[PDB]
Design a protein around this nucleic acid. Sequence first.
RNA 1: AACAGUGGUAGGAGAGCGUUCUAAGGGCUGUGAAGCCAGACCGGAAGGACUGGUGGAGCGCUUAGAAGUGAGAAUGCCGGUA
RNA 2: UAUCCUUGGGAGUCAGACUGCGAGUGAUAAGAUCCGUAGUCGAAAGGGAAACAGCCCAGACCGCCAGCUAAGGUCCCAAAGU
RNA 3: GACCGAUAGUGAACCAGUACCGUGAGGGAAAGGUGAAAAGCACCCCGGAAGGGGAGUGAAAGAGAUCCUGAAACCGUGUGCCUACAAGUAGUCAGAGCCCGUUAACGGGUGAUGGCGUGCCUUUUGUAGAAUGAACCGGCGAGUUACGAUCUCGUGCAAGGUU
Lengths: 205, 117, 101, 49, 109
Amino acid sequence: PKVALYNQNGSTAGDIELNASVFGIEPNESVVFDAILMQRASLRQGTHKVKNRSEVRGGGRKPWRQKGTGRARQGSIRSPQWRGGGVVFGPTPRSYSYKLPKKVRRLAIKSVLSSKVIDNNIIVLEDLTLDTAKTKEMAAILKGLSVEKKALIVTADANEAVALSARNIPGVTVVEANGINVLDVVNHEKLLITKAAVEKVEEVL
Amino acid sequence: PRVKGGTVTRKRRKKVLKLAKGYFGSKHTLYKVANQQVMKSGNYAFRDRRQKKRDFRKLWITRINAAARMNGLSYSRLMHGLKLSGIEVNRKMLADLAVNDLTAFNQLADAAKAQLN
Amino acid sequence: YAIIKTGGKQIKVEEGQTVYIEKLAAEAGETVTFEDVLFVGGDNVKVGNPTVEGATVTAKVEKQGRAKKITVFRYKPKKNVHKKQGHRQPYTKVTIEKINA
Amino acid sequence: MKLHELKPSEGSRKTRNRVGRGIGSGNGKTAGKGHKGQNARSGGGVRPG
Amino acid sequence: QAKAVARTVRIAPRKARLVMDLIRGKQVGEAVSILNLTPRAASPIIEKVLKSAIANAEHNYEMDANNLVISQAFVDEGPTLKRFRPRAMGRASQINKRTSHITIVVSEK
RNA sequence: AACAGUGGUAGGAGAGCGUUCUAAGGGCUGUGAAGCCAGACCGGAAGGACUGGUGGAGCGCUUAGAAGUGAGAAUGCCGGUA
RNA sequence: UAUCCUUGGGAGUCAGACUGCGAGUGAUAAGAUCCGUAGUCGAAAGGGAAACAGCCCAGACCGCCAGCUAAGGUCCCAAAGU
RNA sequence: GACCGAUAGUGAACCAGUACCGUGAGGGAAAGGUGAAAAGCACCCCGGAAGGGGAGUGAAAGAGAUCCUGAAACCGUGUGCCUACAAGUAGUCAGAGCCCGUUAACGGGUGAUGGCGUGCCUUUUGUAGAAUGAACCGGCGAGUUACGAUCUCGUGCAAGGUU
């Protein structure tokens, strides 16, 4: 919880003390896994409906009499083995989400932040001010800060100008200090934070 | 999502049809009866894999019997004489090869006969 | 030519041939010997369970074999009983030198 | 831990039992319901008491 | 080495093959003779396309009329015309009107 | 290492194989992918590679998830052909 | 010798057959029916009895061109003693 | 869109509620794919044409009007081996001969001859059964979801847990 503080142009300052109860907790792998699975299922919307036998525009009459005919006994022309259709136990429109306890989700998010701390991909950027929404400026900022793969930036107050600029990258997205989740944190593999959001999330947790 | 019945049917049926070459007519081209042959072939294979021991033993035995009778000896008395001659760990296959090296078979037979009495 | 009981079944063996027999504990490049020898052939010294001293059969082993697949299939009809099991039997390729009598 | 090395808690995941698929798994032709019973047909349950 | 094909001429392939197999592997100059002097349904068709086959020497790679023989030739099925012949008891039975591909491949010897 | 065991219907339990999508990481592809066709290869099994020919653009692998997920039979249904 | 009890989860089974022995009914008839008891089939392939589910001997995790054997058999078909 | 990719998905991707059937109410189909561009075959020969063979276009003509790919049933043509004194769930295993030579390995094809050996499934006490079902090939085609309950397992907290 003693990560060094960095400036805009890659300059470094005195290190920042971090909350032990939030960032030094030994992570729980199973809890992090279940939290991943939780909103991973929650993102999908699951709209798929396939026409059951009773609603396939036809059927109705008996095609031929039961006995005295060389054909097999058979019901409506729309039937499961019948070619025209009528499927059985198809996908139905339904919800793929549930809920987890507050303690569990807070433990999970603490676990993943602390895991990021212990593998040292947290870089703290205090007072992230940019006077224009141009993209190549923060591109040069990130090249100076030496990040190559994906990343995530959290800044709470400067979001109105940063969000237009940084949304250009497909793999890089801003988030507010409120909206911290597990997929965005794990996937983006390099968490960019400001000290104001550090204290904000610190008091939230 | 929906899973279609893709290449798996072609692969599995082509495997057994490939394995079933040489069969008579429809049994080597139509799956419904080609498969019906191969479990029959598997059972016959296992049964005669265990039956090969006994009919080969019978072949060795009748060859040994001929070898004993043309030295004027019954096969049963031959093996009896061998057993009280000693622990004749020599067995039916290599006694059969002794028939194809018959002079050695003679050299065993007279030893068994002379030991017998 | 002599008779070597080897792996539970005696094989007739001559000087200079090669024989496929069951897989020993020796490695695939070092010569091995079979002690329990009988029916030395030629001048055919032969005793019941013979203690023919100095007649062990030196033999160089060059393979750690694994024989061809026999697909063993079982089924009992009208009963939906199936049992399929692949099988390879291990072996060793042995060449034979210095038959001793 | 990243996503491409996802490990669940062992013993907290169980495979589903797909009845009536082949014979090697068991529950084959009859799909694990015996023979000719009233319970053996669709909707064949009796009232619980 | 010349080849001509029929490509779906309306005739049963079996009825083709019966007069068709008898010219297999003999000299063309008398094969055409035996074939236009046997009365069959297929004989004028195979006569026609066989004369086209030997006729692939004019504006073609050059062979000559003599010393020329059928190498190999066969009759191959084409798509069948489905037809429904009416039948007693209102049964409406079904008949197949077959079509055939006839191949002639002729080489010099 | 030693010992013992290893027929099997209904059934019950445990291990797995394979298919289509979906994320994560990795890469394969006109210097020819998928699919097809043929081989005397590999595993205990479901199966999986390798090399040719066709084919002329898409697809494996790793781990996890979710299934319209596995056909030989139902006088099954449709198409084609005896 | 090691299998017994309690609780909980999940079943299928309620058409059995034959051969012994002990009974019924029957005509001390039935490959009859219905009981008790034992085995086998059921759900057990291999050897014998010509072929054969219940008779006799004996239990198949696989492989071996190993030996010994149970019922039964050893003139030949057809292995072993004219 | 962890929905379908043309037997799916609307009956209807295509002149479909059409063709067709019914007096009428009504029922109700099948049928997508050349190429990037038609650059879609000038010209020659056979022929009445169709259809072919050439020449030409293209990256491809095996790409030429169901025209991407073209499995199987089915049907043909050459052949390596075998077959006219032999009855055979058509195999398997021994096995001589002959032919060939491979994802090189105690190889491949064919097999004169010998031993053993009455298909698959369902239902039955019992089936080779003269009980039932299947002409064949290909495709489709049967234990899912919702809401609760219970039990096990695994997680977070624990006399509290929880929206």
